[PDB]
Design an enzyme around this catalytic site. Sequence first.
Site, PDB file in Angstrom:
ATOM      1  N   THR A   1       0.828  -1.205   0.000  1.00 49.38           N
ATOM      2  CA  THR A   1       0.000   0.000   0.000  1.00 49.38           C
ATOM      3  C   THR A   1       0.865   1.260   0.000  1.00 49.38           C
ATOM      4  O   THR A   1       0.598   2.225  -0.728  1.00 49.38           O
ATOM      5  CB  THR A   1      -0.899   0.011   1.231  1.00 49.38           C
ATOM      6  N   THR A   2       1.886   1.270   0.853  1.00 42.10           N
ATOM      7  CA  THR A   2       2.775   2.418   0.995  1.00 42.10           C
ATOM      8  C   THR A   2       3.562   2.685  -0.280  1.00 42.10           C
ATOM      9  O   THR A   2       3.964   3.833  -0.532  1.00 42.10           O
ATOM     10  CB  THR A   2       3.690   2.177   2.205  1.00 42.10           C
TER      11      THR A   2
ATOM     12  N   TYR B   1     -12.464  -3.625  -2.418  1.00 41.09           N
ATOM     13  CA  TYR B   1     -13.559  -3.185  -3.286  1.00 41.09           C
ATOM     14  C   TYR B   1     -14.647  -4.238  -3.478  1.00 41.09           C
ATOM     15  O   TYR B   1     -15.830  -3.925  -3.292  1.00 41.09           O
ATOM     16  CB  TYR B   1     -13.008  -2.708  -4.637  1.00 41.09           C
TER      17      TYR B   1
ATOM     18  N   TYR C   1      -2.596 -10.187   4.723  1.00 44.95           N
ATOM     19  CA  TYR C   1      -2.539  -8.768   5.063  1.00 44.95           C
ATOM     20  C   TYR C   1      -3.967  -8.248   5.170  1.00 44.95           C
ATOM     21  O   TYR C   1      -4.748  -8.234   4.202  1.00 44.95           O
ATOM     22  CB  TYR C   1      -1.731  -8.003   4.043  1.00 44.95           C
TER      23      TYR C   1
ATOM     24  N   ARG D   1      -9.157   0.046   4.495  1.00 47.63           N
ATOM     25  CA  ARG D   1      -8.855   0.247   3.087  1.00 47.63           C
ATOM     26  C   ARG D   1      -9.579  -0.708   2.157  1.00 47.63           C
ATOM     27  O   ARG D   1      -9.881  -0.322   1.021  1.00 47.63           O
ATOM     28  CB  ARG D   1      -7.343   0.136   2.832  1.00 47.63           C
TER      29      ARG D   1
ATOM     30  N   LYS E   1      -0.230  -9.735   8.501  1.00 49.01           N
ATOM     31  CA  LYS E   1       0.075  -8.372   8.816  1.00 49.01           C
ATOM     32  C   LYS E   1      -1.241  -7.702   9.194  1.00 49.01           C
ATOM     33  O   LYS E   1      -2.214  -7.667   8.266  1.00 49.01           O
ATOM     34  CB  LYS E   1       0.756  -7.625   7.643  1.00 49.01           C
TER      35      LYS E   1
ATOM     36  N   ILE F   1       5.711  -4.443   9.692  1.00 45.21           N
ATOM     37  CA  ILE F   1       5.879  -3.932   8.330  1.00 45.21           C
ATOM     38  C   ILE F   1       5.470  -2.469   8.429  1.00 45.21           C
ATOM     39  O   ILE F   1       4.278  -2.149   8.488  1.00 45.21           O
ATOM     40  CB  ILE F   1       5.054  -4.711   7.302  1.00 45.21           C
TER      41      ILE F   1
END
Lengths: 296, 296
Positions: free
Chosen positions: B45-46, B109, B135, B140, B164, B205
């Site tokens: 994501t980052t 989504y 994860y 999100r 995560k 992370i």
Amino acid sequence: KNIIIGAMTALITPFKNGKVDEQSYARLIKRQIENGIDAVVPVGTTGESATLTHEEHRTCIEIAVETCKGTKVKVLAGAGSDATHEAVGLAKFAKEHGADGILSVAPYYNKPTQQGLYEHYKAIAQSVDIPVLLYNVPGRTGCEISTDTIIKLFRDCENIYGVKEASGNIDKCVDLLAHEPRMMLISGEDAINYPILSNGGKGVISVTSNLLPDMISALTHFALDENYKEAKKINDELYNINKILFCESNPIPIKTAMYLAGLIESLEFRLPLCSPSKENFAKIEEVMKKYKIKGF
Amino acid sequence: KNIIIGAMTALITPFKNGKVDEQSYARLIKRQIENGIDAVVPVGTTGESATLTHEEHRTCIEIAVETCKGTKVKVLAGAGSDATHEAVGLAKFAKEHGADGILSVAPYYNKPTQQGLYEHYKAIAQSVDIPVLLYNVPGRTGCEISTDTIIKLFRDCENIYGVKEASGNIDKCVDLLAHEPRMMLISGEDAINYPILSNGGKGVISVTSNLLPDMISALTHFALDENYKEAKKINDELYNINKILFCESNPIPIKTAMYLAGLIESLEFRLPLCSPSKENFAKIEEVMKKYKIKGF
Ligand SMILES: NCCCC[C@@](N)(CC[C@](N)(CCCCN)C(=O)O)C(=O)O
Ligand SMILES: [Mg+2]
Ligand SMILES: [Mg+2]
Ligand SMILES: [Mg+2]
Ligand SMILES: [Mg+2]
Ligand SMILES: [Mg+2]
């Protein structure tokens, strides 16, 4: 502004042997046209936009355009993305291949700021000259297009004419139309179609209309003609099916119902979507028995 | 199980004139290696996975693998997608191109059911023979991998080795490790790194470690040795920067901070991400002045 309003269907995408069943897709669109629908939306959320390839997405848009040609039914093509460059490419494709307008979901996953959403939609709207409907569904995207951002986009970008709201927030619907009564508020939540329409909403983009196009189109047309008593009567009658179609994530229930009604050949999804649980399969089948389902 | 644990960094992806700055990317990874980090995560994501192309995504994985050769540092490649066929393709690429393992975000989504999440991750895990870290980030994705589903995947798929967690839910962290103490719980939320590690989590992370890799590294290694006094002191000292790095959606603040420290040449995002507001730009800078920021 040019607009696309009225009773509209978020088309399911039928699969056969892992590929898009293109003959079934056209046949289902023809069934929508015959039951009073005003526009169809190929490859929105209900159409499994996330798991189609960019090429399959484009094929579905082309099928919708071709099937609706010569009818007064418009094509509002799904064109959203969490990447602006991808959404712009989809927007340009829809314009160049004859869609009447585009639907564009707020970016999912990456949670843009309001400034980022404004720049995202401005890039989309400036890329084409056909109408653009914003689409707010924070339960799926993780972000919300605020009322202020929606109104600024409506006032600043010629083609942006309204928003599909799927947020369960009638207060925001009042806020939107009290401060910008010229925009087209479109219901994206079937159970509350009538409340959105009675506050001045001008259409629906429906999941339920896949199964019951005649009932959703009638509800919308009653409401637009200010027959609120009859529109509420259908909205009330539809509550049970409207809720059961979300007992698991859309479009798992609506595809299940379409299969149970004999309108698609196979109950096939693309992972990570899959068949409902046995219990929910039985609940959907039970709720459907109360409704008259039109054939082809 | 083969595992990837310890102090890990969710790498930002620097851009220069709209393209990935591949030289900057390698230099940033070398800086992580030299400051005690145990593994790097390219294109999570980052790293703006949503707005990279599949080709750019693969390029970043390759730069990470090449830069970590000859070191103790592992590459846990970002490989998640909301489409199972895309996630399998990324997993297979990471395996064939030398990654040590993959991180795989829950589908965003399209909101799969728990059964669908199970089938999604089973397909991914069976496609490779390297470790797979789940994860979970519901804020999100719009969905969440339940504790039961995480544990079933851990027990049923030899290479799924942990999760995560970025859900702000320490109760769930207790639930996971009380019922399946063999799994590797990894913190995906910097502010609560120490509480997750002190309950038996085995790594982080981190977003903050992009800017302060030595501090996150020390916190993690202190905690893994049960030097909780020292680990908590660093977690407490980092709280202000940990929170300000989420004043707007990650990675807008961390990229801003890296630019403010001269560690990247351009404050460039891909739409729909964009620069923070002027006020948040100044707030980030003011918090950064309280911390000792390593150079190259
Ligand atoms: N409508 C057909 C295209 C669907 C593509 C995609 N599955 C993935 C879109 C993507 N931006 C691809 C990024 C690839 C590199 N990580 C995403 O996964 O966010 C999505 O938008 O849901
Ligand atoms: Mg009509
Ligand atoms: Mg869309
Ligand atoms: Mg190695
Ligand atoms: Mg991932
Ligand atoms: Mg130390």
